[PDB]
Structures are given as C-alpha cells and as structure tokens.
Short mmCIF file of C-alpha atoms (C1' of nucleotides) and ligand atoms in Angstrom, two decimals:
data_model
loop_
_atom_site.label_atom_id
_atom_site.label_comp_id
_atom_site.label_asym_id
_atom_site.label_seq_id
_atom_site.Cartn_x
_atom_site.Cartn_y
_atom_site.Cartn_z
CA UNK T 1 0.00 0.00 0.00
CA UNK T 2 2.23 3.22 1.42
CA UNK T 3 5.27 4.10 -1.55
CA UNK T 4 8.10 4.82 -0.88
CA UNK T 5 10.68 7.92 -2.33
CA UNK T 6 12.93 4.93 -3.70
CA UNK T 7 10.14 2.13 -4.88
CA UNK T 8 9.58 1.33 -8.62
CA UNK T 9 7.39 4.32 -9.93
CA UNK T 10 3.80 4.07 -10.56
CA UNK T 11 2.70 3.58 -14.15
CA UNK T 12 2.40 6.80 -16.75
CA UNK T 13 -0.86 7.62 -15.59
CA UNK T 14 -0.81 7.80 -12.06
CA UNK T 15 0.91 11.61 -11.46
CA UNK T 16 -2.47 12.78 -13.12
CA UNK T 17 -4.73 11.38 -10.28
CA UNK T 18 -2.90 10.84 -7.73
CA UNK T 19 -4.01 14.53 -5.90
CA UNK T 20 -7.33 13.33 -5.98
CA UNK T 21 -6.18 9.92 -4.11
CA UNK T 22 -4.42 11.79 -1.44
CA UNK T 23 -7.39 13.82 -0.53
CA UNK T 24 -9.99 10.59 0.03
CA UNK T 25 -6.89 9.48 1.83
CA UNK T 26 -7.67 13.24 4.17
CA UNK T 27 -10.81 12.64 4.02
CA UNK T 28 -10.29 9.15 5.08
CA UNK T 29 -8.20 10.66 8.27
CA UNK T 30 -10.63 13.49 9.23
CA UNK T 31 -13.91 10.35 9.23
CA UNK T 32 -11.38 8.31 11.37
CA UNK T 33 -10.83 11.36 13.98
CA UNK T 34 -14.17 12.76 14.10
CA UNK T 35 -16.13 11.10 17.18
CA UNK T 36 -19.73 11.07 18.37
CA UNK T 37 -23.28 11.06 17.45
CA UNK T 38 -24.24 8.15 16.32
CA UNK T 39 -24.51 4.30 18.10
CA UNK T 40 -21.50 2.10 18.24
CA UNK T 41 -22.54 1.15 14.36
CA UNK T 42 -23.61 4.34 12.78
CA UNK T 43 -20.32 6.20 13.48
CA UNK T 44 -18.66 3.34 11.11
CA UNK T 45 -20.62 4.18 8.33
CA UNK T 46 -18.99 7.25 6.21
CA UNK T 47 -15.43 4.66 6.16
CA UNK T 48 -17.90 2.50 3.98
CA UNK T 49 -19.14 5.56 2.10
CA UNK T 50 -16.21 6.97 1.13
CA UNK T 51 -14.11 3.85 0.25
CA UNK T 52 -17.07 3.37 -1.65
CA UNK T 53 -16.86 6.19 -3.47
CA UNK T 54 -12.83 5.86 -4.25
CA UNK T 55 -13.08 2.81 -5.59
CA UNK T 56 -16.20 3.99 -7.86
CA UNK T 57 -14.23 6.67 -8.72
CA UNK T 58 -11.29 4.40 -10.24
CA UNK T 59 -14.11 2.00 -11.88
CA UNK T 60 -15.36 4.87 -13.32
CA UNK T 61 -12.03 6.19 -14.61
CA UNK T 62 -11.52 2.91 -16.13
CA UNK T 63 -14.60 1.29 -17.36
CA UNK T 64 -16.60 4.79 -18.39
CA UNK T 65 -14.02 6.84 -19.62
CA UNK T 66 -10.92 5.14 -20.56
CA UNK T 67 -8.70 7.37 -19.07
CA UNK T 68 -6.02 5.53 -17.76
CA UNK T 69 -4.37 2.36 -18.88
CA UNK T 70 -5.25 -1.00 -18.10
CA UNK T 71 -1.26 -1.54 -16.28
CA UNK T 72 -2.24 1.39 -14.13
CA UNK T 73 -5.25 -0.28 -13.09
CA UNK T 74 -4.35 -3.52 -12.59
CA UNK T 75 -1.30 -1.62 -10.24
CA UNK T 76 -4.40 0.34 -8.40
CA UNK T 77 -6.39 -3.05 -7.87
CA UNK T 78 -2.68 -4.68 -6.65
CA UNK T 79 -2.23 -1.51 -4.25
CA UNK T 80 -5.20 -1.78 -2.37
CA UNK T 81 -6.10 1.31 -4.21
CA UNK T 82 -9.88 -0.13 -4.75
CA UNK T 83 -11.72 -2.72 -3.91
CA UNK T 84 -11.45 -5.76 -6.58
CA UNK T 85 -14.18 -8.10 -5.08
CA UNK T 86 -16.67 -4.62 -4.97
CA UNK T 87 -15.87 -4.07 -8.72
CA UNK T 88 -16.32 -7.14 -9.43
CA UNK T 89 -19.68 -7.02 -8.35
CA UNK T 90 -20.43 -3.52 -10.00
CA UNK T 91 -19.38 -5.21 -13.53
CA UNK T 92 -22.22 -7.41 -13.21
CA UNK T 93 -26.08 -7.19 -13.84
CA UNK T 94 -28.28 -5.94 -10.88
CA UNK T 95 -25.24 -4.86 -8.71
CA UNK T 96 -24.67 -1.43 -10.57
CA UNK T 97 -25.25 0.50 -7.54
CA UNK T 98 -23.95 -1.92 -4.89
CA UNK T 99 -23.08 -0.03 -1.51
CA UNK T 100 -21.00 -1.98 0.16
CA UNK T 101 -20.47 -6.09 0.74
CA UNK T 102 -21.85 -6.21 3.81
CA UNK T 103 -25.11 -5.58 2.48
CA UNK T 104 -24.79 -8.37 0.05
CA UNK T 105 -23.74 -11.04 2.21
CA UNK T 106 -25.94 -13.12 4.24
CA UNK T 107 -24.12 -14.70 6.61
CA UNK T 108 -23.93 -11.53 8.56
CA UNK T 109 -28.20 -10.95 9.13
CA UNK T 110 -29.96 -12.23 11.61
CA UNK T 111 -32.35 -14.20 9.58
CA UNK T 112 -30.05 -14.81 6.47
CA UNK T 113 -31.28 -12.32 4.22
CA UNK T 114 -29.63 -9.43 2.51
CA UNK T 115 -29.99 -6.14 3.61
CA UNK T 116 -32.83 -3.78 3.20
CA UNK T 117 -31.26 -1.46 0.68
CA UNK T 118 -31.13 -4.13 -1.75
CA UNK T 119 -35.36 -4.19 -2.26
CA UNK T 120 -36.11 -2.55 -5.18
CA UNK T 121 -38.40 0.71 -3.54
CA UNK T 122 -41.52 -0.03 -5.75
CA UNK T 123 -41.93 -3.58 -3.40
CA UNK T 124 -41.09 -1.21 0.00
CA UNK T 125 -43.04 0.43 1.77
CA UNK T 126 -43.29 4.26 2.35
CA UNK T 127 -42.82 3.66 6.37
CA UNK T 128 -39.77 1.33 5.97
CA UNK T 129 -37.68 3.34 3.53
CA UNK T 130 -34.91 4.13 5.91
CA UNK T 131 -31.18 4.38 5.57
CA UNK T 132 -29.09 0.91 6.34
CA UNK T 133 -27.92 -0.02 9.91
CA UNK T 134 -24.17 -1.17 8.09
CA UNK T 135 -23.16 1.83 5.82
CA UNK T 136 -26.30 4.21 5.39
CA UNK T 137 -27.37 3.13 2.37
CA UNK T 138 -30.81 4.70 0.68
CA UNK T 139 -31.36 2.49 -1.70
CA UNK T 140 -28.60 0.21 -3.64
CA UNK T 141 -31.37 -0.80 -5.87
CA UNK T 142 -29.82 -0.77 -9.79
CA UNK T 143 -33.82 -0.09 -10.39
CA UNK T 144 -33.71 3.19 -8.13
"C1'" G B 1 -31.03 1.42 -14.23
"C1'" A B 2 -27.89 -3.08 -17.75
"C1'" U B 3 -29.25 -6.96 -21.24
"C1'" C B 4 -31.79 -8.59 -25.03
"C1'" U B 5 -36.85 -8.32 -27.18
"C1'" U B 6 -39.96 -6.04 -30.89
"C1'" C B 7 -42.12 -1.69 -28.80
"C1'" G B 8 -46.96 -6.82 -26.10
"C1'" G B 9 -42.41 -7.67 -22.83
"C1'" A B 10 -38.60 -10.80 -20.93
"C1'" U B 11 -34.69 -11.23 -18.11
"C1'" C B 12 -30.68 -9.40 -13.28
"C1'" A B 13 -30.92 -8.20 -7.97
"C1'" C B 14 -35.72 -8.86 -3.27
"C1'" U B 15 -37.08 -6.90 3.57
"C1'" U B 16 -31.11 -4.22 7.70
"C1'" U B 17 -31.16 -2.97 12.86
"C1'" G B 18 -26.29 -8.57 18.84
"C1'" G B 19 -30.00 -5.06 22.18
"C1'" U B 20 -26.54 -4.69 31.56
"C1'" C B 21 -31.16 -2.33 27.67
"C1'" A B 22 -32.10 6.21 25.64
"C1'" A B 23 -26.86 12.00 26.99
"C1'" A B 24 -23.22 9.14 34.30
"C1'" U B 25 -27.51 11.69 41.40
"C1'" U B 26 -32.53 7.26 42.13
"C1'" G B 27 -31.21 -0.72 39.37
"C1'" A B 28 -22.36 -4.04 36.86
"C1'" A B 29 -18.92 -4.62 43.60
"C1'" A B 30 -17.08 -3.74 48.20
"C1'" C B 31 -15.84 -0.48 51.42
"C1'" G B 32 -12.45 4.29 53.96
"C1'" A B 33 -12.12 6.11 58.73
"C1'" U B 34 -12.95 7.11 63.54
"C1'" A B 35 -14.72 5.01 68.64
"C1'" C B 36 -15.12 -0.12 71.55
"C1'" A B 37 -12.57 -5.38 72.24
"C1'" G B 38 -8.19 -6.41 70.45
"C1'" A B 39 -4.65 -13.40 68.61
"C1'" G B 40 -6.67 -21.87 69.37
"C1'" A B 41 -5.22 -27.04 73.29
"C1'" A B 42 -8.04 -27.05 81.23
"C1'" G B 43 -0.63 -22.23 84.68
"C1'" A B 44 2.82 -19.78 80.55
"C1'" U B 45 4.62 -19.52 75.94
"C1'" U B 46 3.28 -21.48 72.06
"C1'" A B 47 4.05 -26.57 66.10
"C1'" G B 48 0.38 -27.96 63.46
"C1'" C B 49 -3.57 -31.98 60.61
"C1'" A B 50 -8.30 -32.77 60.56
"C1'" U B 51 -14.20 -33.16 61.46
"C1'" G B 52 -19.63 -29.86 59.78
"C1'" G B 53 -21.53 -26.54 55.80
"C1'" C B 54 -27.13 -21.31 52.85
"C1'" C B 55 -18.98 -18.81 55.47
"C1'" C B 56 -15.68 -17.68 52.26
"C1'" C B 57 -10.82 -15.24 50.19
"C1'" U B 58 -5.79 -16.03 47.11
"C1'" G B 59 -4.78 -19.63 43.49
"C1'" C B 60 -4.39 -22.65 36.72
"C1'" A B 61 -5.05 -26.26 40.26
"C1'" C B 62 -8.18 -32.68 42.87
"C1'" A B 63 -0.80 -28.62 45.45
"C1'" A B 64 -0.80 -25.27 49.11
"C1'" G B 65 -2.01 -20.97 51.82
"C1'" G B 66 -5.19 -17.19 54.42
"C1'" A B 67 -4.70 -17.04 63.13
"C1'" U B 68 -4.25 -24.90 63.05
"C1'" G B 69 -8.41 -19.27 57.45
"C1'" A B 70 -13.06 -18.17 60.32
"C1'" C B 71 -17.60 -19.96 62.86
"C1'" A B 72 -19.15 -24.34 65.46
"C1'" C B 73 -17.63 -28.84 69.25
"C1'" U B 74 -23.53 -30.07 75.18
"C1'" G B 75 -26.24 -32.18 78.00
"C1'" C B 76 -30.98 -33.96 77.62
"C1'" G B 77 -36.70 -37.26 80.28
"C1'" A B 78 -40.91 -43.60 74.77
"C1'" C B 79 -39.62 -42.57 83.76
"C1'" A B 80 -42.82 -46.79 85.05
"C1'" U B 81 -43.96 -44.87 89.43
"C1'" U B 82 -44.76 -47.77 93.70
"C1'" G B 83 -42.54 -48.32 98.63
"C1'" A B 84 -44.94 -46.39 102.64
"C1'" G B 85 -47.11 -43.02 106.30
"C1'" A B 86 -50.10 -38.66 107.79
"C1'" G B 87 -53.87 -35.09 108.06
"C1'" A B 88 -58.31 -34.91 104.64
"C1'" A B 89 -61.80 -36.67 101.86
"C1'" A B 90 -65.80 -40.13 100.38
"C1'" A B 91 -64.31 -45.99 101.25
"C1'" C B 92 -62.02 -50.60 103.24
K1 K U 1 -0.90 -21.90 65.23
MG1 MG U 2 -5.06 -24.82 55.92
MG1 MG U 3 -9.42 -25.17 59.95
ZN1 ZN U 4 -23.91 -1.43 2.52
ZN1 ZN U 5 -27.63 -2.23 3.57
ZN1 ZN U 6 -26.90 -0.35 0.39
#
RNA sequence: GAUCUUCGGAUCACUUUGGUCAAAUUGAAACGAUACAGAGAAGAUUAGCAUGGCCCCUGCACAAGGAUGACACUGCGACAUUGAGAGAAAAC
C-alpha cells in the first residue's frame, strides 16, 4: 500500500490522479478522527461511504471513460487502491449501484437475508424506507 | 437502471437494525475512617492436621495458603412410678 521515495514508480498515468487519491486518503483521516453522534454502528458508516466512493471513482475512470491504462489499473487493484471483489460485483447485472459487501452477504443478518437497501423501492413500503444499519445506504437498488 | 426483445415484454438483484437495555444523582462490587474489644489445646509460651456446611478469600489447580483461614464442638426425660405413712376426703 504506502510508496516509498525509492520504490519502482507508478505507471504513466498515475501523477495525473494521484491529488485526488491523497485527498480521500484526508478525508479518510478526518472520518477516522471525528467522534460522536451516532450508536457504536452508525459512526462506522462514512469509512464504507467513502471507500465506496474511491473505488467507484477508479471504476469509473476505467470502465466509463478510458482514461487511464489497463497496467495502471491492474497496479491500483494490486495496491489496495480499490476494492477488486466490490468491482467485481459492479461489472455485473443488478449490482450497478452496490453499496458496500456487507449488504450483500448473508451470513452476517440475523435471519439470512440481505440487507434492506437491496429491495427494489416499488416492493417497499413508504414507512420502511430508511437508511441501512451497516453503511447508510438509501437504496442500492440498480432499479432506483 | 444493464441486457436482449420487438415496442406486447422478458430477463438481473428482493425486507437491515447482537440489544446490563435512551446523553453518568434514584437498578455491573465492596468499602475508607474514627470510637469499643483487640490473637486456638483445662498455669505460661506457644508446632500444626483434621471433622460440619445457605462462610468464604488467594490460586491454573483434585498442590498449598489465608490465626491450626473463620464460625461451630452439650447435655438432655418412649420414667414406670410404687414403697410407705399422715392429716383430709368419700371408702375398706
Ligand atoms: K498456630
Ligand atoms: Mg489450611
Ligand atoms: Mg481449619
Ligand atoms: Zn452497505
Ligand atoms: Zn444495507
Ligand atoms: Zn446499500
């Protein structure tokens, strides 16, 4: 994961992104520091958001709009740079909008069913539209 | 939303919430100190091992320690009464 001055330079395309990487990385910090308001689950939620959102944001440079080299991403997916198994799962039908794994697995619910965010919103009702207990989700739906 | 399909639709995915319990005087234990006595075996000093269980404490322990760990160590009536006398009463 953490370079080093003297380790084998990143492919051609990295210098262009990596500012971007280095703030979710301060981002990443500040969500690790800040304390309070929430249960002993909901304060774990925005780590889930926002790795979820870095590791959208390399699927997207990859996958949407080609900018960046397949050796550079295969280096990002090495370097723990994004998540493979989560992209993996995005690169397949009716998991566009996945959240997070958690929410997918069902080993980890209390009566082995997925989590909530998964309905689609036209089968749920208005009452029980709420955000998810594991990462806040409103609605991973690929429908919604 | 993605995929086809022929603009009828079909696929793909489908119900979270570990809860000694809501932001700490009034439902997670066990006591400090001061004041009283104040260290087992029939004189006196003192080795200990046990017995009993709604007494425990330290210990990983079925070792061993905590004053021999402490408390306790007693005691009574399935006695039948007649053996007799005396004054009374009721009776030989
Ligand atoms: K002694
Ligand atoms: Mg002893
Ligand atoms: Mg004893
Ligand atoms: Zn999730
Ligand atoms: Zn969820
Ligand atoms: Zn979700």
């Amino acid at each position: 994961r953490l370079r080093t001055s003297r380790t084998k330079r990143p492919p051609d395309g990295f210098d262009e992104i990596e500012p971007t990487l280095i703030e979710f990385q301060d981002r990443m910090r500040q969500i690790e520091n800040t304390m309070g308001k929430g249960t002993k689950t909901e304060m774990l939620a925005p780590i889930f958001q926002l790795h979820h959102q870095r590791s959208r944001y390399i699927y997207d440079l990859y996958y949407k709009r080609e900018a960046i080299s397949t050796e550079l991403y295969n280096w990002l997916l090495k370097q723990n740079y994004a998540d493979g198994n989560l992209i993996a799962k995005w690169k397949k039908p009716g998991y566009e909008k996945l959240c997070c794994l958690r929410c997918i697995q069902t080993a980890e619910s209390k009566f082995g069913s997925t989590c909530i965010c998964r309905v689609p919103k036209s089968k749920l009702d208005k009452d029980q539209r709420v955000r998810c207990t594991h990462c806040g989700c409103n609605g991973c739906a690929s429908c919604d």
